[PDB]
Amino acid sequence: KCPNVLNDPVNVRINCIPEQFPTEGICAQRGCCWRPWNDSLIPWCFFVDNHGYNVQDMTTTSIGVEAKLNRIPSPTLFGNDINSVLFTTQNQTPNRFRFKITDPNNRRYEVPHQYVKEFTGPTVSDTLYDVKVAQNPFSIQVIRKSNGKTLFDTSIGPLVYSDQYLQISARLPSDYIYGIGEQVHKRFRHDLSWKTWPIFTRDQLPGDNNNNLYGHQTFFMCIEDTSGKSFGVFLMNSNAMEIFIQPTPIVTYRVTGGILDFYILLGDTPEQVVQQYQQLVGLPAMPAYWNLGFQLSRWNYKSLDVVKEVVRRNREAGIPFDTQVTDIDYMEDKKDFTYDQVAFNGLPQFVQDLHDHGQKYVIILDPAISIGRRANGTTYATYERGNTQHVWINESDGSTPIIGEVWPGLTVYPDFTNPNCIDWWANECSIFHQEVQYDGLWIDMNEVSSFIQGSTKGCNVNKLNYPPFTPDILDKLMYSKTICMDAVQNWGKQYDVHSLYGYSMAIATEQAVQKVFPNKRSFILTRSTFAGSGRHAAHWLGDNTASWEQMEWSITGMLEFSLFGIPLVGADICGFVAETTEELCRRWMQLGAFYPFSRNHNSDGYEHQDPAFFGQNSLLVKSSRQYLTIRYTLLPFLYTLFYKAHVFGETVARPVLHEFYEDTNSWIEDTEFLWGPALLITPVLKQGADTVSAYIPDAIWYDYESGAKRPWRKQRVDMYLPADKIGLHLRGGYIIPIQEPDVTTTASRKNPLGLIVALGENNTAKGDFFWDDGETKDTIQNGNYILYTFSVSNNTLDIVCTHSSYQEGTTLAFQTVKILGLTDSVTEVRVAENNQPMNAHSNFTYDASNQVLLIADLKLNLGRNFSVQW
Template identity: 30%
Template sequence: MYSLKLLGALVLLISVPQTFAVKSHDFKTCSQAGFCRRGRALASRAKEASSWASPYSIDLSTIEIAHDSAKFTAQVKSSLYPDVKFGLDVRLHTDGVVRVRMDEIDALKKHYDEAASWALISEPKVSKSMKWSVGKTEFRAKFGEGQEFEIVVQFNPLKIVLLKGSKEQIVLNGQGLLHMEHFRPKKVEAEGEQKPEGMEDAQTVMKVKPNAWFEGEDEDAYWEETFGSWTDSKPKGPESLSIDISFPNHANIYGIPQHATRLSLPSTTGESPHFEDPYRLYNTDVFEYIASSPMSLYGSIPILHAHSADSTVGIFHAVGSETWIDVSHATDKSTETHWISESGILDIFLMPGPTPADVFAQYARLTGTPVLPAHWALGYHQCRWNYISSDDVRTVQKRFDEEGMPVDVFWLDIEYSQDHKYFIWEPKNFPDPVDMINDVAATGRHMVVIVDPHLKRVNEYPVYKEASERGVLVKPKSGEGEYEGWCWSGSSSWIDFFNPGAWDWWKSLFKPYQLASGGWSWTQSTEAVHIWNDMNEPSVFNGPEISMPRDNVHYNGWEHRDIHNINGMLFSNATYQALLERSDPPQRPFVLTRSFFAGSQRFGAMWTGDNLGTWEHMEVGVKMVLANGIAGMSFGGSDVGGFFGNPEPEMLVRWYQVGAMAPFFRAHAHIDTKRREPYLLDQPYKDIVRDILRLRYTMLPVWYTAFRETTVTGLPVLRPHYVTFPEDKNGFDLDDQYYIGSSGLLVKPVSEKGATEASVYLAEDQVYYDYFSHQVYRGSAKGKNVTVPAALHQLPLFIRGGSIVSTRERPRRASTLMKRDPFTLRVALDKKGSARGELYIDDGETYSHRNGEFIWRQFFADKRKKELRISSKDLAALRPSDAVDGVALKTFNPANEFAKSVSGVRVERIVVVGLGSKPKSVKVEGGQTLEWEYTPGAASNDKKDGAAGILIIKDPATPIANNWEISVQF
């Protein structure tokens, strides 16, 4: 977050951006990054050469095959430098994932090899059943239930291919761009090296350097590099890593967030239109970012999905340094990518799929699933920079209640803290913080306050003083003392969360009681306060690219360049653990992070950063949230209304519709914007937004059930079209509509000014119902676009035929007050008169669900000739091989304590949509006859479009935790 306001008199000495527009010159392009220049030049030479061969090959005399597992190791040699050796390790995991690692052997220095240890939840198990077959030129291993997959390792040149049947799925080094720059003494060059055979055409580029055909003529930024006024010393010299990864039979790729662009990634080279620069992964504080760009943003997850109608595959490259990725859609059936990283080792996981669900599961087994959030965290969050006082917070809460607008969380930005010393309340405007927090908590709500990673360098600040005394701060390039930079606190230092000494200490800070050890703790807080971790890229106002110098030193001597993209994840991880340990029994923490890496999904939510209040940013925010979900970060959203600017009422209404249909729903605004709390809107906008907020709350059972699923399967909460319909080619590039979990709800957000209608794509020969009007729309087996009403008060939201959606319809001021509210079931019949749906609930706050304290139901609707049966059954009993957040369902007790505690919660209404004829009677099996009301439709569910026939069953009073059945007789 940036502002024109001063940070005190010293602000003139630091480079804080002074205009509200992205300054592209503050951030590198590939041509301004030496290692990216070298990598792209390598690709250009390969493309221009009439013949090209990778210089890397396996030394056959070094091959070792494990006798008890599907693993082999070998040394890799390079014809460029015969004396330099690399170690290759290829292993097959029990679930079919293939891991490929390569590192330099006996190097002068050590390449950073710890990225995977931070990202993975555990060391994957290597298969003992799959075996390698050895040939003269390659290794092969078949795997999969039907032995449909095969991994092939070719010896010379080194190439690794994953096949499904006879089709290549993933190819490593197929274009010969693999290059791990070895460590070398400065200004010492080998002489007399010979060019490899087949490189005669490259003679003209070998005038200066024998290996110029591959590495180029000059030492380009090997030992030092300048950008603007900053000089980056490179004490280890060149150490970049280049690898080409191709998908010969997949035209669409998704992932590598975070970028503001299409979900199906456009090209960066070759065919037009394309971006000029590669996609960059380098966590960066880019405020007011461009709405269509490959520029790096706040988070980096090096994962790709490649998709076709035949299969889905994925790759995850565990590298934490800056990485650039060129994308080329060479043909309409294939995709080529080129990964160029500043440092690290080759550590690539090949995920064979073959379905999107399989790839999500394979990645989740590596890096973990999203954490199940507290139920209240799925409600509406109200934030701005800044609510200026404790009285301001109380007033905002009062206004929400007066206007009948639900809200669960109030947020405080940096101005709550005295001189931006986090944890220390500003005494003038927040004289009674605990009373303020308790006033919010008394209404069933929570607060979130910001805690950034920079610490004001004054001994009067106990957090900085203790960090300094413990030696857990990041060091400058000398490795001595403390790095000093500038951020909101002025002169600041940064906690090094790679240092184990910081972990327990950081946890102790959040305890809302005095520590027995005498250390400082946040006693002016309560367990109702949760945390927002911002600026954790890290953002440094006077640093290169608004970040930390790459030659700064972290724990164990690693340079910042090695771990930059991992840094933000460790901050949110430590904060999550701190909140987890402050209460007994533990309460589920809420932590929002701006910076993230692979594995960050285990620690909470993210948002898309400092966006603009424009239609373009509203639109691209939807695509960014979808892309983050592809990479595991399901709990995401964009700031409603845009962080910068003053959106007109129409735009603000549309943005609330977008936000209400995102997993994380928060409104936020810059300090220089006009106040825009929703109750300040004029009519009719205020009423429309109130309805949107209430809609979000009625749908909380849908969102919570979807989150339960992602915590088990890894499938994203928001599902792009290719995930739901993986064989429908028409939808592979679709990213402006999506499904919410497995609920059957289809959303088409409107992000166009003045829109009164929208086009929605229906992929199947199935009926869809407008969520509000029950208008019928029919798809086609070949796919079909339908035009739907989308005036300002209308959100295009549809129930897929065959779905049963659970909601809670009673208006409440906060979600915590809904725990004993009854349910409504919307039964949307498919063409055959059937429907299915799930509901998951638990206490929403603790971890008692891990002890089996929950309700998990499946609802059925089955139509026969003269009867429709609607029933509820215990899903844990139906699927005992499944699990719920680690609970083995074979031992699940449906009469658990939580189920008993909500035994009085019932179904109060059932709405059957798509019923073509009027019933004769409706009754509970073995019980009383029920009251009902039937409205015939303008079209039955097997004829042309029109309003659907509706049956409303009034208060069946069936307990939500019990098995029951209702018979509708015709």
């Protein structure tokens, strides 16, 4: 059966043959409607209303609604349907609604999240949403009651619930969708034109395609209208899946196992929706201050002598960099928890030299543990202890450990979901730290990557390894570049918990960090990610390529991870794969200075690409130094945004639409971004370019370098950015805290502080500032910090300390206040502490050309309150 109207509307057709080229026979065989088309974007075979479920009996509970569902008895799709299914609603908060669909007569796999708590009460009354549930056929419908706009409309297609194929579709109210990962999107706002996005954790070079990559994030967000009203949709399921987007727009989930567990999250602004999502899934970890310093790295330095030569040439070029990373070449025959005693002879002395300069040292750690013997024939202690404690992932029998292959040849895999394994791991890092004093860890190969397909002895041929429906994952082969789908772990079968491996290792390393650096924050950088891995680790965008495309795409990739609540994120500056250009790398170093996580990294064999390799008096070194210096100056501001992220769930690097949603031009913009609300970063992203077409939003902007008020507002301009400049603007209405830069955060942190006041329209400005020791894990939780509020109006600045419980912070002071965009010239400056009367201040400069005032040599000590008048 087909729609009564002959020339029906095509954008509402839900594809009935999603895995294969449509044929009339298979269409009929599935009981769907056959009606071919001029192109092959539009489905030729679609369920009109032929598949689905009906409600028979539904009741009310205190929390929401239970409903028993029965399969409308159409033919099967991929077999093993479940005829009798249970729908459950939970009105969790006034802002988030949750529904789930389960098998009453069997406990199906449910993601064993480590933060998402079970909900039972209390009952929330007066919610912002409204849930209508159609009866025949079943469909859910979520409505914003405020204005009656319907957000999530299941009525548009069937529910298909079979043992290995799950399908539900939803009509959305606008054409603006953001998120889903990890893939290369290229553009921040989604193309709606019939696109599949496969999600399944996987080791793969990011390129121009829809391949599933390192992380598994199902969250997407959507802006309803010009008032900023938005919502988000998160599906809690870790099986392989496709998310399909088509015009109207109707998004469709096709998933290979588990249950359907949806959360729908309302907000007043896009910023609020992202906050709501992090509330549910976990707020991001607060980083250590030194995490924000610049990092140098490469795969295969070959020897400690080359590492040394790189460090000293960069120190000499005056490049600010806090940390030195060291890839698998530091290890002995690429074995975890060892170091090459020959080519990396003298490592602990070198580590000592780093610490002597106030620098830090990060090592890579892979999950795979070698079955082999050490160099001089001795038993490999890590492997031996692993056996003793039975730490490994077993084959389908549940006894024999599975054998893959990674860097050191054949290997076994730790089951980081085992509480014994987390102990073993923590122990290994503790033992190793006594030999080599690392400062932080970088966990790689997280996806569970294997160089061989499946296992050392291949895969058993079954429904788990060769499922009835495979989504568009690379190679269309589940066990490709990973382990057998029937492998057993403590949380479950590989088929179910595959995408959770990287997640669990981040958790395991967060414990390991507490054993090694008691009560410190350290550093954990992870590759694979699941929902709310922000809570445990930092992420970088993987193995990119020295390529202008790839540099452009990193912005929209970084902004997506901001949505996913992993704020400490960056790409590999200058390009991992391939040799980089002087020109490309000069530009990427400018942009890279403004990634939340800022690190230059390179692949094996290609020429060096660290800044100082391009020449001590090179334009690249001059530029990089200048902008890394700007970065370091702004670190107090950045760090404060990270505090706000950790506490309220705000974004650090945010897209322009988050602040300027009243303008529909901001909705599509993704070639520039912001640090929080105040700083606008506009990079050069085309080869050879001298100029860039930039959309400058609806506010007052000041050039960061000069301080001059730009004559631009709510318009597109041709911004002139020569070989050494990158667009930096401060937004009027904001006060940002800065601190005199140095070449390490260690050194910079004891330097005098300062404020920048970008005045805005009504001659107002607001700002905040958070300061602690930047490393102790529980400072926020124990009230051991300083917190400030800034306020300007009537040509007078108020510095208000709202909390003060950190003694070593009292020694620092704001000693410099720069005020941009003055309406009238200045004669006298007066300064008062607390509420004492104001004395005159001599040291100041007024520049009538730029309307800039800079007040020098003050002594506004952290801890106390002050006023400054001009």
